Design a protein around this ligand. Structure first.
Ligand SMILES: O[C@@H]1[C@@H](O)[C@H](O[C@@H]2CO[C@@H](O)[C@H](O)[C@H]2O)OC[C@H]1O
Ligand SMILES: *[C@@H]1O[C@H](CO)[C@@H](O)[C@H](O)[C@H]1NC(C)=O
Length: 319
């Protein structure tokens, strides 16, 4: 019947979508987001981030986060919860602080504990640390890395696990889906967390790809199995395949095969629990405001009509 039914028929836990609170007032949007044939899982695109949930130190704010959880709960959809520690979308107080390791650690741990405890039992997974790597595999020079060093990462995992020992804890990043230094460095994060003694359950592969320049099914698969070999699960967490505009029939058809390989790479890897697309309609994609001249990235168009990429996805899922 749809993406999520197809996914689950192959053994995946879900096919799902991100959304954002402003979109939840659009009734046609909400009807299709709530269609469990297509979507068994939801991620908040913004309202679980640090700026949203801890706008002043020790002053937490959950209304926007909880409204997306309430929508998933209404529909019987799973949640992925995103994200506890990331260099982007920090409030002023974190980025302007004069910190020591001790003071930043305490603020970081308190942020994780509060937000994880709040959502205890409500999330299938947390993206505990997002985008910790540079493209060469070195560590990104965030405030956390500068002040705390590499240990920020396992400490973040340990703190999340203490607060909610049942939820799957993921490391999430982009450009870790194809073979190369960054992917290798992502395997090394997995290793490092466990060497610390901290828990990590999964690797999140963002999968912000480009039409006609998408990793091949064989390399995607090699890379997924490179993670599952380590004793973790994997998921594609923010899949979108942006095209250089203008849209054409030929680019739509390439987009289909590109999405098809992603689905099929996940099916072919035991331990790939699911795919989430980064929203589901071109109308609300984040792409055009970030990647100038690119757009039309998703399986439905801006009028909420299925594109050929929907059929590519179904085909990759063996449906
Ligand atoms: O802010 C982050 C973006 O920088 C990131 O951009 C990536 C650049 O490399 C490209 O090949 C990837 O496709 C593209 O996503 O995406 C995630 C975002 O948070
Ligand atoms: C910060 O403190 C923790 C111990 O709590 C330690 O693991 C880490 O190396 C420290 N980092 C720095 C840069 O001093």
């Amino acid at each position: 019947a749809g993406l999520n039914t197809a996914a689950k028929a192959k053994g995946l836990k879900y096919f799902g979508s991100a959304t954002d609170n402003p979109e939840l007032t659009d009734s046609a949007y909400v009807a299709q987001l709530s269609n469990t044939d297509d979507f068994g899982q939801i991620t908040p695109g913004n309202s679980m981030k640090w700026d949203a949930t801890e706008p002043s130190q020790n002053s937490f704010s959950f209304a926007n986060g909880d409204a997306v959880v309430n929508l998933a709960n209404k529909n019987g959809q799973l949640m992925r919860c995103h994200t506890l520690v990331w260099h982007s979308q920090l409030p002023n107080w974190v980025s302007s602080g004069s910190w020591t390791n001790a003071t930043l650690l305490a603020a970081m741990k308190n942020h994780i504990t509060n937000v994880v405890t709040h959502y205890k039992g409500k999330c299938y997974a947390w993206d505990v640390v997002n985008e910790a790597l540079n493209e060469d595999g070195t560590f990104r020079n965030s405030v956390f890395y500068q002040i705390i060093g590499p240990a920020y990462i396992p400490i973040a995992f340990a703190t999340a696990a203490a607060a909610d020992p049942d939820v799957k804890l993921y490391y999430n990043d982009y450009n870790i889906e194809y073979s190369g230094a960054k992917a290798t460095a992502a395997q090394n994060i997995v290793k490092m967390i466990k060497a610390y003694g901290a828990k990590i359950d999964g690797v999140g592969l963002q999968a912000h790809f480009i039409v006609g320049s998408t990793p091949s099914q064989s390399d995607l698969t090699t890379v997924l199995k490179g993670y599952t070999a380590l004793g973790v699960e994997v998921a594609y967490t923010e899949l979108d395949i942006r095209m250089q505009l203008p849209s054409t029939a030929a680019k739509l058809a390439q987009q289909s095969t590109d999405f098809q390989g992603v689905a099929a790479a996940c099916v072919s890897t035991t331990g790939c629990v699911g795919v989430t697309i980064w929203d589901w309609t071109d109308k609300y994609s984040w792409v055009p405001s970030v990647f100038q001249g690119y757009g039309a990235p998703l399986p439905w168009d801006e009028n909420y009509v299925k594109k050929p990429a929907y059929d590519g996805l179904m085909a990759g899922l063996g449906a």
